[PDB]
Structure 1
Amino acid sequence: ALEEAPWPPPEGAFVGFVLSRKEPMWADLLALAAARGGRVHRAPEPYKALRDLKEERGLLAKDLSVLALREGLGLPPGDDPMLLAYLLDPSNTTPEGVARRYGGEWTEEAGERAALSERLFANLWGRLEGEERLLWLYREVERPLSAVLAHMEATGVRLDVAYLRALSLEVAEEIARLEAEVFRLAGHPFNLNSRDQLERVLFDELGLPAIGKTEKTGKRSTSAAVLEALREAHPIVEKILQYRELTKLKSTYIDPLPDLIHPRTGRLHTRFNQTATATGRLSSSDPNLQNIPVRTPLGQRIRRAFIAEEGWLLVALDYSQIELRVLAHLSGDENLIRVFQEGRDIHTETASWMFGVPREAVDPLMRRAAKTINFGVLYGMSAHRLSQELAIPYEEAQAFIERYFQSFPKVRAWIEKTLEEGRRRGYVETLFGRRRYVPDLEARVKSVREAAERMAFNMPVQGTAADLMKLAMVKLFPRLEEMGARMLLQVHDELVLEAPKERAEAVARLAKEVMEGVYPLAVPLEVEVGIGEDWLSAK
């Protein structure tokens, strides 16, 4: 059923390629082929072959396109069945699975990936027949978004390697200073990075009362949370909390990053995974630049490492109280939509309450803490964990939650209806109609069911802010090109741009606008914007 023709593929053919590794920016293009009609074309020289394609359409289009950009080609990504499958069911996140479920086998031969892409696209496109809302998301958001992501990936972001190189030697000494103490207090050395070894030390050798257990193996958890509950029980606990901090940071960022610099660009090249989340958010892989530190002083010193190119400036844009604004529009709650019409800030209001200080006294590090409290509580946190969390009585934590939802009467109502129809329909969806199947909404085990429910009503809110960000990226990108500006990073509701100093102002102004007016809601969408030579100074 499949014939073979000489390389030169007819326009609009489905590409198939094989990389030496999963990272497009570092991969060697080992094989390139294409499938169209009922024939398949294998390119004798892939790199040379790339020059002929006009569009990379097929399985993992964005990745091949990223490699193209890296090589000097402007080959934009087109149709990609993965995107179609991701829209039908966000649990379709890998080609292997998409293939086994929709019509084939993900192999290692380019010709086969080409044939596979064609038929997968044929089958998946049919399944979308009549899914107007999903087709809208595909052609108006995803497909075009993939191209934006390609440019972002190949563009990359600059890092101060010398800065981290030296920061490492410094932290190396503090870590040593902390472990050396931990051992003194324990009366003997042991692998502090070993959770099992530390467990025995705290709970058996010393007599510290265990607080909780681990999920799959029932060990006495040694969590930061457990450790904070014991901070005053013994001097060793605080030291271990600082060791945990430094080592987490040093081995996850300070050391790995400097070695991820690409030779040809001198920049860090993250990957932006478009079909990896159940709610519609993107994920940042290999270099994951979506979880760069920002909470602690050492975290900030690390964020300061992300810098603009000489003669440029980074522009950081971030939606204010994003998911709360989305919630007001989804729930349609009176008091909540008014909160925003009145210019209030829930995070600041909660922070004022938490630290018993006047609103105008809340610093950013207090407001942050407030955020995990508001979203934690909104999405289901228990009084128990709340009380433990804020270190307050169980009652006052129970009161905080009582008023919180009582203040926004429509929220709980919306949640219920979201859950009701999630039960009957078997899935919940976003404003734009992004679907997430939550079968466990009818599990007979309370534990499982309620866990399903929390996953279910969070999806429309989280997923709607995602559609929103993606849409804004699709609208903003072209404007930046014509303006000679770059879109470097996306952090769920934030965007990091790099604009020429002469234009930094004008770019910030334009982006903030595109973002706030992306899709008008029952509430305005505010965007805090910052400009500076490093990511930290921007935000």
Structure 2
Amino acid sequence: GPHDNYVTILDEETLKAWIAKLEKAPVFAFDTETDSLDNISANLVGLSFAIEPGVAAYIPVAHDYLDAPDQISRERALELLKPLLEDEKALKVGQNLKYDRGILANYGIELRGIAFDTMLESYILNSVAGRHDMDSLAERWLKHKTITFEEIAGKGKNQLTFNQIALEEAGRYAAEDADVTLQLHLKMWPDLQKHKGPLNVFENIEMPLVPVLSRIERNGVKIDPKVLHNHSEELTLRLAELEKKAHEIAGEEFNLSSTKQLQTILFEKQGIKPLKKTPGGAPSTSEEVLEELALDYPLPKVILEYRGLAKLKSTYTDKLPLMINPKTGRVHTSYHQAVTATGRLSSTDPNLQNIPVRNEEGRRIRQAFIAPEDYVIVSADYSQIELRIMAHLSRDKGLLTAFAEGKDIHRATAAEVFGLPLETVTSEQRRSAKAINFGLIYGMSAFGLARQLNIPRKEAQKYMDLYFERYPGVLEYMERTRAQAKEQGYVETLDGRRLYLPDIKSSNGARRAAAERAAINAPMQGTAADIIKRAMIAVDAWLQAEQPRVRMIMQVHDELVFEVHKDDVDAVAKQIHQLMENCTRLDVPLLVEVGSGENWDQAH
């Protein structure tokens, strides 16, 4: 770490000299810093650059600390750097460049030449290799501990903002960060040049997805606090009466959200044997035992409704309206990308993905999500997309014929297992079939099937054998992928994304079974996520090309929620059909079920 070899820039002439160094550099680190972690407001503080290793410069344009001399106006710096920033040819590297692009766009400047981002480099090298933030990269490829903001800030309360810190140590911090990013890129990129499939995935899918994520985050989502506030009162009422009834049944007052007290009082009153134990080892009060014991006593069922209602109230109606952005009135998520081993995206801050559906109050909270005036919600969805993936990859003639006809075998198997007629199967039974069938594809044991559907374990075994008799090509494909994981030491997706499994070697056996099932799991879900990502890329490309009133707000796993004006509905629906159907070259069509409604629940 060639520290203290950098420079802090306080004059515009040295800024001209620095950019005259920059424009001819092939790649150069670039990062910006701000006081707050919320990108939406995020008033800017400063920026840094670095051309060659050991050399970096910081320009403080906004600080408030006592006696700040000759800090360059942010306007002049932005005007001078705009030709470099808006240039497409210029190639840049950095950390969390989505944040940087968002901050720049807050001032009306769109960064174009996003060449490489270190976190994506590390993620595409090896998904399961620890954390992918800056500290882990520094530790595992530079072996040099770096100065963190905690060192110059407070412990847990008095974390003074980056604007009110002195220029010297702040500039050294920023220059060191930019430099470490630079050597990380220079070390990591040639190593990625070695492999082919990961290189193609990195060049095609991952990187161009930063601007679309930034724009989607900047769009925001609209919600009404009023409906949530109203629903909260009925939640509180219902929980009050159910709690009163439960405590009159027990004759004692205890917290029904406290698992310890619940299990103690239950197992000391009923005196019945505990059927299942916690993974750490203890009496447990999970769902399935509760539905099992509800037939005998009213306390199990009433605490079941209590658990559901309390979870709903304490999570959704108490987090969603509180986190609304003040100046815009629209909720903003995070959408971190390099977090999952498989490759799918994951919402972080408010987690607008696990919105309850099955419960009537769940579809009510779904109804709560509404659109602004003259705008209608449009949903574009794949159906059984990974089933089409699996049929394409295994070339099983049964699945090929079923998808050629378009049969809802996903629902037909539910009708068979539950005994329901094909026409009377409901949504929850469809979800249960989803779980059962797809676990059966993923090696889900017959004991798990007996637990899920309450059917005898013998029936679970026999019907698993039957299901694999229908599709023997599927079984031999899992066997082939197991052999591939054993030999290669990893599993690769169709487009080239990889998952390294260090547990494929013999280790107590049981651990390998999880590693084995993950080896089967990785390709299918990875390809589904990659198809979703490329569909988003093409859709947003058309968005930027045409610039109509359509906006994109939300991404749910196998779902793309839109925002269109009420006047134009069918045209954008056909456009989405054309782009989303033709995004991926696959044997069977990627059938899409478009939907339009007033609010989110109306769409689906």
**TM-score interval (norm. to shorter):** over 0.9
- For the aligned residue pairs, the C-alpha RMSD in angstroms reads 2.1
Amino acid at match of 1:45: V
Rounded to whole Å, the distance in 1 between the matches of 2:186 and 2:487 is: 30
Superposition pairs of residues 314-329 of structure 1, within 5 angstroms: 314-329=377-392
Q: What is the alpha-carbon distance in structure 2 between the residues aligned to residue 336 and residue 22 of structure 1?
A: 48
Which of the residues 298, 309, 314 maps onto 1:251?
314
Return the offset for 1:91. Answer: 2.4
SS at match of 1:268: coil
State the partner residue of 2:281.
Answer: 218
1:151, distance to aligned residue in structure 2 (A): 0.7
The match for 1:61 is 97
- Aligned to 1:450, what secondary structure does the other structure show? helix
Q: Residue type matched to 1:211 in 2?
A: L
Structure 1 residues 224 and 150: alpha-carbon distance in aligned structure 2, compared to 1, 3 A threshold: same
Distance 1:208 1:155, change over 3 A: farther
2:56 to 24, 31, 40: 40
Deviation at 1:439, TM superposition (A): 1.3
Give the equivalent residue in structure 1 for 2:597.
Answer: 532
Change (3 A) 1:388 1:285: same
1:137 to 180, 196, 201: 201
**CA shift for structure 1 position 5:** 5.5
SS in 1 for 2:593: strand
TM-score (norm 1): 0.94
Give the corresponding residue for 2:574. Answer: 509
Any idea what the Cα deviations from partners look like across 1:92-134, whole Å, max 9, x if unmatched? Answer: 5333222322335563333222222222222121111132221
In the alignment, is the contact (CA less than 8 A) between 1:62 and 1:77 conserved in 2? no
On the 8 A contact 2:31/2:100 being kept in 1, the answer is: no
Q: Which amino acid aligns with 1:35?
A: A
Equivalence map 1:288-437=2 (5 Å) = 288-437=351-500
Q: 67, 83, 89: which is aligned to 2:126?
A: 89
Could you report, residue by residue, the CA deviation over 1:500-532 in whole angstroms, capped at 9, with x for unpaired residues?
222232222222332222112122211111111
For the pair 1:166 / 2:262, whether they are aligned, the reply is: no
Cα shift at 1:455: 1.3
Q: Distance in 2 between matches of 1:403 and 1:521?
A: 28
Does 1:492 find its partner at 2:560? no
Q: Which residue of 1 aligns with 2:164?
A: none
Between the aligned residues of both structures, percent identity stands at 42
Q: Say whether the 8 Å CA contact 2:200–2:496 is kept in structure 1.
A: no
Q: Aligned partner of 2:535: which letter?
A: A
Partner of 1:16: 31
After superposition, residues 106-145 of structure 1 pair within 5 angstroms as 107-108=148-149, 109-145=173-209
Distance change in 2, residues 1:297/1:121 (3 Å): same
Q: What is the CA–CA distance in structure 2 between the aligned matches of 1:76 and 1:484, rounded to whole Å? A: 23
Q: Distance in 2 between matches of 1:21 and 1:279?
A: 31
In 1, are the aligned partners of 2:485 and 2:504 still within 8 Å (CA)? yes
Q: Secondary structure at the match of 1:43?
A: strand
Deviations along 1:13-36, one digit per CA (max 9) or x if unpaired, are 322244545543365645432222
Contact 1:35–1:114 (CA<8 Å) still a contact in 2? yes
Q: Residues 353 and 138 from structure 1, CA distance in 2 versus in 1: closer, same or farther, beyond 3 angstroms? A: same
Which amino acid in 1 is paired with 2:125? L
User: 1:200 & 1:287 partners in 2: Cα distance?
Assistant: 34
| CA contact 1:487–1:497 (8 Å) conserved in 2 | yes
* Alignment equivalent of 1:196, drawn from 245, 250, 260: 260
Task: Say if 1:508 and 1:529, in contact at 8 Å, map to a contact too.
Answer: yes
* Change in 2 beyond 3 A, CA 1:105/1:519: farther
Instruction: Work out which of the two has the higher radius of gyration on C-alpha atoms and give 1 or 2.
Output: 2
Distance 2:313 2:411 in 1: 31
How many residues align? The count is 538
Q: How does 1:272-287 map onto structure 2 within 5 Å?
A: 272-287=335-350
Deviations, residues 270-291 of structure 1 (Å, cap 9, x unaligned): 1111100101101110111121
Q: Judging changes above 3 Å, is the alpha-carbon distance between structure 1 residues 99 and 168 closer, same or farther for their aligned structure 2 residues?
A: same
Deviations 1:195-250 (A, max 9, x none): 111111222333243222222x3121211222122221321111111111112111
Give, in angstroms, the shift of residue 65 of structure 1.
1.9
Q: Which moved more, 1:134-143 or 1:112-121?
A: 112-121
* One-letter amino acid of the counterpart of residue 140, structure 2: R
**Does structure 1 conserve the Cα–Cα contact (< 8 Å) formed by 2:8 and 2:59?**
no
